[PDB]
Amino acid sequence: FGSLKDEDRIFTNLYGRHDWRLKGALRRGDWYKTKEILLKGPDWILGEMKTSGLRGRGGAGFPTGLKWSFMNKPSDGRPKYLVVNADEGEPGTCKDREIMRHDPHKLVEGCLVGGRAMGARAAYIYIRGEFYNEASNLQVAIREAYEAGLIGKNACGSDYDFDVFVVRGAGAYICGEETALIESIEGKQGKPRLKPPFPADVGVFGCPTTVANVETVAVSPTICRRGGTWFAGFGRERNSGTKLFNISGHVNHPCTVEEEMSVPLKELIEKHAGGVTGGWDNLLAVIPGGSSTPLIPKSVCETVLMDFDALVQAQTGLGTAAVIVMDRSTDIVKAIARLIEFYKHESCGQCTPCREGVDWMNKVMARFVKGDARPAEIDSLWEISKQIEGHTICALGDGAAWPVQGLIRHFRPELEDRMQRFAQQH
Amino acid sequence: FVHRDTPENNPDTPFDFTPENYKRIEAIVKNYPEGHQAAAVLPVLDLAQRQNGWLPISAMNKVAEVLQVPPMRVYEVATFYTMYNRKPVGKYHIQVCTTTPCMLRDSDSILETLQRKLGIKVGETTPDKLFTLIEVECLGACVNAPMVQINDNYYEDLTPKDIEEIIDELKAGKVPKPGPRSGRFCCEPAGGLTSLTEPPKGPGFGVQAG
């Protein structure tokens, strides 16, 4: 039912409005119970997130507590590590750009609060290189914090030691991937590693490592301060907590609001943000989780509620919860076509399926926009789509297939007409 | 992806980190784990790019040298990332975001305007070697869709005219107020701040017990 209270809204400094710097942060009281929390114990911190039942705030959804629990296993003589990926290459994820730029501190204490939960020696934050100015803001914030002694050895007047670092991204969406963030951190080409050796057991510089969406790390302190329950209540069943929602494209006032999760899709454009540009009936389709997730047509939009599972039932993913909206004034065949162009210019090419498959769909999609291709080819694209969905080394091939599948699933008649239109003029 | 040695772009172009640059180089290493320097190739390669936009084959060889890594190792890193430029870069190097979010909100619109203003095709440097236009992909900051990153400036929410204004500012003078040239601060509902219009609770507000 959303409509979270301003007080409950974790990221108050969102939109700025309060000095993003430490003195603004102190009025925010972000560093209020940090010593106590760490003192309580690592086990106490994970109890808090397990009670919260928080889901991954990045595109993949998994219990946050269980993921952190995995490298809580005893150290084998290799320093455990924390990796925070501030890269958000996915379209519509200006979600993270806020916390980093507007409220850098929340993430800094998120890092050490999270750090003792996994017993990480240190945390590296991979902010996308594109955001150079953004980087300027966080290390100013990180510098403030150590000057204070909030972070560093004996951080926050406690036995525990932590050091936080910022790493430059270099314009790659794939760098974002969990195994590939590491390799970029390692300094090799940003190519996802394989799944069997999970990043807990192997990882950055070969030491145990864990990767979290910046929102996931940032919400940690509060979740512990407010307790898992407070946070647990807002969510729906497995779904829980407020997740920032970004609405971009064909809406009167595109904005990122951290309104509550489980929001009726019709409600968030209509009540907050801006009602769909041109009217709620001028909605050809909604992209709930960003480019990777399949778009849902207006038919179900109103009925839909914004939750990780909700969208699942709906065959779409909450993902980064980036709402991209397309009025009846857009050539979807071309809209999704540029997302496949978005993925051919970006996939690493390490795996055969994605390399040739994504390029193959790009060529077919460009012909589809022209209408040159015949109606029978459409099904092939579907078939090409699932070959790439289950065979890829990472999830990006997973992600490339879904928008193609969505276009065929709900807009098959329109593509046939574009097929028909070209055949008629010869 | 092949460096055919050319008089301009080839090692005859000597490269060496400024005494100041070399300094920058070392601290970075320490940022990474001890015994680990290879991990710094990217950050370093970035400072070679900071030094000079061209970053020729000579510059990458130096990077590998300073970082004691297989030279190819640096060549592979430079080729994989779009951030690095292996060819000369225009002083301004504007990049226009053309992913669906920006296109839906008119990103394409901006392009046509910029091509005419720079009076040049998309993808190459102006003769004046003043600006370089490229159709880059999602640069983040989508809520503000019309967008054109210029050396990190990241101007946002721009209407075609605005850019022309910006370009002129760049063409005569400098620092043309980089940022959203709109009336919305950072990202904010153009209407206002529905999320939080109240004052922020202070330190230790409703902090749970335990």
């Binding site: 510098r143 050091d163 | 920058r24 320490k30």
Partner: peptide
């Protein structure tokens, strides 16, 4: 307007300044 103006070396040089704070290496 700190965001409004920063130099190309802000990130790196700021970091070097932070080096002193940076905890000892592994």
């Amino acid at each position: 307007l700190q965001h409004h103006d920063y130099n190309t070396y802000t990130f790196l040089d700021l970091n070097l300044d932070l080096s002193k704070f940076r905890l000892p290496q592994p």
